[PDB]
Design a protein around this motif. Structure first.
Motif, PDB file in Angstrom:
ATOM      1  N   UNK A   9      -4.645  -5.495  -1.826  1.00  8.54           N
ATOM      2  CA  UNK A   9      -5.264  -5.028  -0.326  1.00  8.54           C
ATOM      3  C   UNK A   9      -4.624  -5.598   0.650  1.00  8.54           C
ATOM      4  N   UNK A  10      -3.946  -6.905   0.368  1.00 10.06           N
ATOM      5  CA  UNK A  10      -3.310  -7.670   1.256  1.00 10.06           C
ATOM      6  C   UNK A  10      -1.702  -6.787   1.632  1.00 10.06           C
ATOM      7  N   UNK A  11      -1.314  -6.309   0.402  1.00 14.16           N
ATOM      8  CA  UNK A  11      -0.028  -5.763   0.254  1.00 14.16           C
ATOM      9  C   UNK A  11      -0.045  -4.423   1.204  1.00 14.16           C
ATOM     10  N   UNK A  12      -1.050  -3.469   0.995  1.00 18.27           N
ATOM     11  CA  UNK A  12      -1.335  -2.373   1.526  1.00 18.27           C
ATOM     12  C   UNK A  12      -1.551  -2.674   3.162  1.00 18.27           C
ATOM     13  N   UNK A  13      -1.936  -3.634   3.663  1.00 12.98           N
ATOM     14  CA  UNK A  13      -2.280  -3.993   4.884  1.00 12.98           C
ATOM     15  C   UNK A  13      -0.779  -4.359   5.574  1.00 12.98           C
ATOM     16  N   UNK A  14      -0.214  -5.225   4.778  1.00  8.20           N
ATOM     17  CA  UNK A  14       1.200  -5.605   5.114  1.00  8.20           C
ATOM     18  C   UNK A  14       2.096  -4.231   5.331  1.00  8.20           C
ATOM     19  N   UNK A  32       0.079  -6.360  15.877  1.00  8.36           N
ATOM     20  CA  UNK A  32       0.154  -6.083  14.631  1.00  8.36           C
ATOM     21  C   UNK A  32       1.397  -6.373  13.879  1.00  8.36           C
ATOM     22  N   UNK A  33       1.244  -7.152  13.004  1.00  9.65           N
ATOM     23  CA  UNK A  33       2.561  -7.811  12.216  1.00  9.65           C
ATOM     24  C   UNK A  33       2.338  -7.773  10.624  1.00  9.65           C
ATOM     25  N   UNK A  34       3.484  -7.318   9.789  1.00  6.75           N
ATOM     26  CA  UNK A  34       3.404  -7.440   8.612  1.00  6.75           C
ATOM     27  C   UNK A  34       3.394  -8.961   7.865  1.00  6.75           C
TER      28      UNK A  34
END
Lengths: 369, 370, 372
Positions: free
Chosen positions: C6-11, C235-237
């Motif tokens: 989920x963290x990867x998709x958000x990034x 918004x930041x990766x």
């Protein structure tokens, strides 16, 4: 439901690619004298999913003529291997074609002369440092030249498209890669003789001979195949599809008359190569009015003069194929009829010498069943 | 939100037409002529579906009749066989209207390498310049005759996969028009010291050079057997209602060390920009420029670069440099669009300015026909 | 847990939003002209603005061969040795890339898929070609002559134009970045006949009397401006910006004829690519001094044990030509070497001939967490 099965196959494919272990390992090496034998059988390993075979070939050629030299033909080292044939574990044949055709397809798929070294203005010494594919332009009387050639015999279409790949685990596997190399009879052409299958041609050809030839086969495959709840995850459509290269010869050309070579049905032809062996003479488009592909139901879809035909090829491989060699890309929309010959490859020759013929080369997909 | 609806549909229709129709390329016309008699031609293509573009083959035989002096190719050479190209769709709306050299530079930029060129490699197999697709003798000696071959791709659609700019040619009694203005004995040959910008050959033998003949063959590329849905033919209405054009202009009034700014008009989405610094007939390898840039009203400068660094950017685009004095700028991913980024200009701060110096601009852009 | 997925998709989404909303910018940071005899080390202070992706370093030089009779000729690396070393430190003073000019240049080439910023030769009659001499240096400099050189280096932070992994958020005032550049000088740039040409630019009988007249550089900073701001803020990766993308090089010795030389990957790092230069006692050979090369794991792996020419073939598929003599490349971009995924892995070279002072110069390209 088709859409269903394909969606399934593509998913399994990505999983295999993501999870599997990609391997490239030497399967066999051998050195010999063409005078004694020039046909060999390589038995590959039966592990995981086989993608293809990289065939390295080296040779030493000696021109024992007293005064006359010989020079590379247009195909040169591409004729180190005369032919190749692959039988999978179920004894079904995939590719069965000539070495030069296989080489031209390798080039076409790469988008540039296969494994060549591009020339640039770079001051840093990049360049033809390793002579991966190499051969002396000429071999003077009394000299010995060394050549290096590489061929990729594909099973899978590419690194990310496993269509055509082979699952190697079938016990009693009848898997074999057959190779026929050049010999003292095919490698050298006398002045005026047909250079098509030869490596060198010239006044000293009769006294040219191979000192020796050597080959090393590397097998490329995927190991550590993923296993799901229902067992090994595999793209069933990919593994049940054949991706082959094949060649054929056609004759009966007449000046200013459309020569048509029909495509068989069932096959999805990705590309077509046609060599105009004009009775031993290979010309740069000058003996042709035009080439084309046409469905005798909607005329020509690409009737073009030689140079314009060549222009399309330049977009594919950034250069021209050798003289008399014509290429046609149909990868995005494969030639696929249903009735033998609803589509044909056309060449309307301007001049036709004695013993003229078109040497065809095809790349295609087809179902095992 | 109606826009997000239209676009989504346009994309879907595009995908469908690409998958369903079949690509076709066929000759529409061929002619051999003496440019001394005529040099301007109006080609009438067939209206057979969605037209993507035209591949134009041009050949010529040029003789240097000078008793003693030779001529040599100019920097643009065969690219100047066609002086101007103008396309009009069925509605008589103008799309591309540019010079042969600009069109050719865009063909190169789009291919990612010199258009239809043959790359040199160490391969022993005899690949290479076998067919002379684009070709011209480096020099034509006194009394000698040289042969040339040139190709131009006149685009309507942006590419093979993006039909933005394509033309639906099915309007009877209202066909398209491809106007071609070719080189002649006046434009093709530049005397020593004269401006070579539009010439093919330049040299002390120029005055006695003449065309023996020029020939051209136009091939039309289109999509046939268009897919028909539950409500007539399915078509990407946005693609077909958008103009993808190439245009050029000239600008003068440069001053050493002063910023020469060329404003980008509004409404147009500029995909690429080419600037040729015709320094009074002299074309230099960056040495007559302090720097080039693209800046906004906010005097920002998103790309203020010295000539070599600017050239480096281009080398990443086409694997080599454009001819002397030619500068390229790629804005394909984020097209220059004023009023959605503010006023924008292309800047050139010249170091040296000769008499009659000017900047020839070449633009590639998208715009609504409405 | 799937909390990572989920963290990867958000990034990834934040990255896409940043690449779409912000505007790319490249602007000069500083230029300097000097005599390396006076100074050769510079600390460049990049401007703190938005997300920094990397630096394009332009380097020019004038070299004079003042020997009475002997000339000098470019070494295999030539102008790539104008910059001996590059080191970058972000605002938190966390070190990223630290490597030689030649290694960085070879990576630039690998990433481009062709000799970095080179001009390809073609049959085109239109005068394209080496017009602007972006990277250039005379093949030789005769006794008494003065040659001019131009070289470019791309110092990456972000992995690519589309993959911001490794990028640096520089919005912390009073916390500057640091780009250190160590240039070649009269000692490193010239190699006498018989001496090791590894780090030299020119080599030849006239080397002793060769000297720089001057060197000049211009650093351009590439970054993303006008960062998108949302409900919760910019918004930041987060993963991209907290990952390091670096290049480093080391030397390894102890090679013996016909014995496998194994350089273990002291992993925990995700090795994207590996370069091994076989400095065979100052002589660089075109594979003739090597039996084979490969990468193998804990077991008897040999995922790719190949003779030199076939190994070179793989590289030709990558950069459309060969790297200079004695330079070997290995691409692992799609499946990075990560020893925690399959035990220890090593890069192997079984030398056919080993001269005195032989060694393998390893160059690595990898990803790693600012906090692992």
């Amino acid at each position: 439901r088709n859409q269903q099965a394909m969606a399934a196959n593509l998913q399994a494919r990505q999983i295999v690619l993501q999870q599997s272990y990609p391997v490239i390992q030497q399967v066999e090496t051998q050195t010999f004298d063409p005078a004694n034998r020039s046909v060999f059988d390589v038995t590959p390993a039966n592990v995981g999913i086989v993608k293809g075979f990289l065939v390295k070939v080296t040779a030493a050629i000696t021109n024992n003529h007293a005064t006359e030299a010989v020079a590379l033909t247009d195909f040169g080292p591409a004729n180190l291997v005369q032919r190749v044939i692959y039988y999978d574990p179920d004894n079904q044949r995939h590719t069965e074609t000539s070495g030069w055709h296989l080489h031209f397809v390798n080039t076409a798929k790469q988008g540039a002369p296969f494994l060549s070294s591009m020339v640039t203005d770079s001051p840093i010494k990049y360049g033809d440092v390793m002579n991966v594919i190499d051969a002396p332009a000429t071999i003077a009387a009394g000299a010995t030249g060394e050549l290096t050639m590489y061929y990729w015999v594909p099973l899978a279409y590419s690194e990310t498209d496993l269509t055509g790949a082979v699952l190697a685990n079938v016990p009693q596997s009848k898997q074999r890669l057959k190779l026929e190399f050049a010999n003292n009879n095919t490698a050298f052409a006398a002045v005026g003789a047909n250079p098509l299958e030869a490596i060198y041609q010239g006044a000293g050809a009769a006294d040219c001979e191979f000192e020796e030839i050597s080959y090393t086969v590397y097998q490329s495959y995927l190991d550590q195949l993923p296993v799901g709840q229902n067992g090994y995850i595999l793209p069933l459509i990919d593994l049940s599809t054949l991706y082959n290269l094949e060649n054929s010869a056609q004759a009966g050309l007449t000046p200013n008359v459309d020569f048509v070579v029909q495509y068989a049905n069932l096959y999805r032809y990705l590309s077509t190569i046609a060599v105009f062996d004009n009775g031993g003479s290979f010309n740069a488009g000058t003996d042709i009015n035009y080439l084309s592909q046409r469905t005798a139901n909607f005329s020509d879809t690409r009737k073009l003069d030689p140079k314009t035909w060549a222009a399309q090829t330049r977009r594919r491989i950034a250069t021209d194929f050798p003289k008399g060699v014509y290429y046609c890309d149909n990868r995005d929309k494969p030639i696929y009829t249903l009735q033998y010959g609803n589509v044909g490859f056309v060449v309307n020759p301007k001049t036709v010498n004695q013993n003229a013929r078109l040497l065809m080369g095809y790349e295609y997909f087809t179902s095992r069943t």
